[PDB]
Design a protein around this motif. Structure first.
Motif, PDB file in Angstrom:
ATOM      1  N   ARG A  92       0.828  -1.201   0.000  1.00 29.40           N
ATOM      2  CA  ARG A  92       0.000   0.000   0.000  1.00 29.40           C
ATOM      3  C   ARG A  92       0.865   1.254   0.000  1.00 29.40           C
ATOM      4  N   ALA A  93       0.340   2.347  -0.539  1.00 28.32           N
ATOM      5  CA  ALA A  93       1.130   3.557  -0.720  1.00 28.32           C
ATOM      6  C   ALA A  93       1.047   4.413   0.535  1.00 28.32           C
ATOM      7  N   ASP A  94       2.140   4.470   1.295  1.00 29.05           N
ATOM      8  CA  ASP A  94       2.249   5.389   2.426  1.00 29.05           C
ATOM      9  C   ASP A  94       2.332   6.802   1.861  1.00 29.05           C
ATOM     10  N   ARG A  95       1.176   7.331   1.472  1.00 25.14           N
ATOM     11  CA  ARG A  95       1.163   8.635   0.831  1.00 25.14           C
ATOM     12  C   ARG A  95       1.590   9.757   1.760  1.00 25.14           C
ATOM     13  N   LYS A  96       1.665   9.511   3.067  1.00 29.70           N
ATOM     14  CA  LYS A  96       2.163  10.538   3.974  1.00 29.70           C
ATOM     15  C   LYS A  96       3.556  10.984   3.563  1.00 29.70           C
ATOM     16  N   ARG A  97       4.519  10.068   3.619  1.00 35.35           N
ATOM     17  CA  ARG A  97       5.881  10.411   3.250  1.00 35.35           C
ATOM     18  C   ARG A  97       5.988  10.836   1.795  1.00 35.35           C
ATOM     19  N   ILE A  98       5.041  10.422   0.951  1.00 34.61           N
ATOM     20  CA  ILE A  98       5.027  10.878  -0.435  1.00 34.61           C
ATOM     21  C   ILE A  98       5.019  12.396  -0.486  1.00 34.61           C
ATOM     22  N   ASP A  99       3.986  13.011   0.093  1.00 32.92           N
ATOM     23  CA  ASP A  99       3.960  14.464   0.202  1.00 32.92           C
ATOM     24  C   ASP A  99       5.248  14.979   0.821  1.00 32.92           C
ATOM     25  N   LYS A 100       5.718  14.314   1.877  1.00 35.19           N
ATOM     26  CA  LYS A 100       6.994  14.681   2.477  1.00 35.19           C
ATOM     27  C   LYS A 100       8.105  14.640   1.442  1.00 35.19           C
ATOM     28  N   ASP A 101       8.259  13.505   0.765  1.00 35.56           N
ATOM     29  CA  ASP A 101       9.237  13.438  -0.311  1.00 35.56           C
ATOM     30  C   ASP A 101       8.920  14.461  -1.385  1.00 35.56           C
ATOM     31  N   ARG A 102       7.654  14.548  -1.785  1.00 36.06           N
ATOM     32  CA  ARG A 102       7.276  15.475  -2.842  1.00 36.06           C
ATOM     33  C   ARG A 102       7.425  16.927  -2.421  1.00 36.06           C
ATOM     34  N   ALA A 103       7.593  17.196  -1.127  1.00 35.25           N
ATOM     35  CA  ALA A 103       7.712  18.574  -0.655  1.00 35.25           C
ATOM     36  C   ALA A 103       9.120  19.114  -0.883  1.00 35.25           C
ATOM     37  N   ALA A 104      10.076  18.660  -0.074  1.00 39.69           N
ATOM     38  CA  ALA A 104      11.440  19.156  -0.167  1.00 39.69           C
ATOM     39  C   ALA A 104      12.104  18.811  -1.491  1.00 39.69           C
ATOM     40  N   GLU A 105      11.623  17.781  -2.184  1.00 41.65           N
ATOM     41  CA  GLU A 105      12.168  17.462  -3.496  1.00 41.65           C
ATOM     42  C   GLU A 105      12.029  18.640  -4.444  1.00 41.65           C
TER      43      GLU A 105
END
Ligand SMILES: [Mg+2]
Length: 137
Positions: free
Chosen positions: A115-128
């Motif tokens: 399943r997609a832990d979309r929490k860290r996704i936004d986290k990754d997608r943020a500072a990236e």
RNA sequence: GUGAAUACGUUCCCGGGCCUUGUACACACCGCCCGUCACGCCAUGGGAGCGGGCUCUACCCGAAGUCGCCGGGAGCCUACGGGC
């Protein structure tokens, strides 16, 4: 004397840090140097990280890859001086630390346990990306 | 040279002839032919098992793919109702 463990750390000049973060329960790829007979290659090897054995410097992680109908696992050390590039691809919810069941039960049934832990996704997608503007000015 | 007896008769033993009968016999009963056993060759069924082909029932995993859904706490064109 009372530095007994600092000593090892002092011996750790072989320490890197350009490694991006991650945690068990997600897929990733490395890029590795192998004596390719006559020469050396960048063997891109993408898979799921399974186990993480932490111990400061000699912390290891184990990656599993299903290649050509064969369940494989691969164990790498974090500070290995052989990792050129290494970039994640996807992240997923954990619920448990290790996961020695993807060994036995490897299929689509893992496409629903990951399943997609979309929490860290936004986290990754943020500072990236949003922090790129905090460079170009 | 002298010079006998009896056939009542065909029931019965023998030979031949003729008629009828049978046949699987025909260089013709010194014939023909049957089955085991012995020898060699040939396929062949049964037969502890061995090797394949094909088909069926059930269950597990499941590539590409159409179709139904979400398309959302992101990617992207925006033709900002939407589409990938
Ligand atoms: Mg036979």
């Amino acid at each position: 004397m009372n530095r007994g463990a600092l000593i090892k750390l002092v011996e750790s000049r072989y320490v890197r840090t350009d490694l991006p973060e991650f945690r068990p329960g997600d897929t990733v790829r490395v890029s590795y140097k192998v004596k390719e007979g006559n020469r050396t290659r960048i063997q891109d090897f993408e898979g799921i990280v399974i186990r993480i054995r932490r111990n400061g410097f000699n912390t290891t992680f184990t990656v599993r890859k299903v290649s050509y109908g064969v369940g494989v696992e691969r164990i790498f050390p974090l500070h290995s001086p052989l990792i050129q590039k290494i970039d994640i691809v996807q992240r997923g919810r954990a619920r448990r630390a290790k996961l020695y069941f993807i060994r036995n039960l490897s299929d689509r049934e893992i496409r629903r346990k990951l399943r997609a832990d979309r929490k860290r996704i936004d986290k990754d997608r943020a500072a990236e990306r949003a922090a790129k503007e905090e460079v170009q000015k």
